């Protein structure tokens, strides 16, 4: 599930690095 806000904010930050 991608609907965990914590999973999304974490999903989005690694894509910087």
């Amino acid at each position: 599930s991608l609907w965990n806000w914590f999973n999304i904010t974490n999903x989005l930050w690694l894509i910087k690095k």
Partner: antibody
Amino acid sequence: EVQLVESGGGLVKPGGSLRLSCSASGFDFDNAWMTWVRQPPGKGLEWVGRITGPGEGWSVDYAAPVEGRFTISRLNSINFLYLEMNNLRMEDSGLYFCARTGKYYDFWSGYPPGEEYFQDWGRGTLVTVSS
Amino acid sequence: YELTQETGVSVALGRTVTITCRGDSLRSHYASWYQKKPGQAPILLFYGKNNRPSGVPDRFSGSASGNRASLTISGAQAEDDAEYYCSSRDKSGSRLSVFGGGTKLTVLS
């Protein structure tokens, strides 16, 4: 359009218990994050705890001096937020608010899990704890 | 409280004033400001990088630099005499939120 009404507050002996209720209307209550915030007398605001939406499995985070004693729950069917309080101390006084928590996270500068802001508030209900 | 504000700041009528909020977590996280009047519910004034909610006048503006977050009120009016609190994460990467010591704005009307 957004409406918030707290209730269930009053006087109570130390170590006692009390359950505060909060009704909501004028928005999508089922997916909205909710947060309880208190203001001790003569002092400023103090973050109590937050209940999440369906996407997070209704997970609940409490404060350090609060956890292990309080319990937050919600009824999306009747749109009611509840704050169960056990082993009440005198420091838990006096006023309690419920607020509609928003979610913010800038992609280029934000840091997970981002930040939480509060869009709407209620009048709050007074909870006095004395012996 | 790991977020620190001014105890009390005063300002003349129709002039600019800037309150600040200090904390280690602010280096990684933004801060949201709220106006508090006695016997009244708080009101969201500003949050994030540059987001002002509707209904809030344009004289309220926020900023962030290092471990400090500031709220500037250019041309403060008489009714701005109130209490203000900044909210953010307690620690860098924490799921918990926390407010500041609170600042009393004294508008000499």
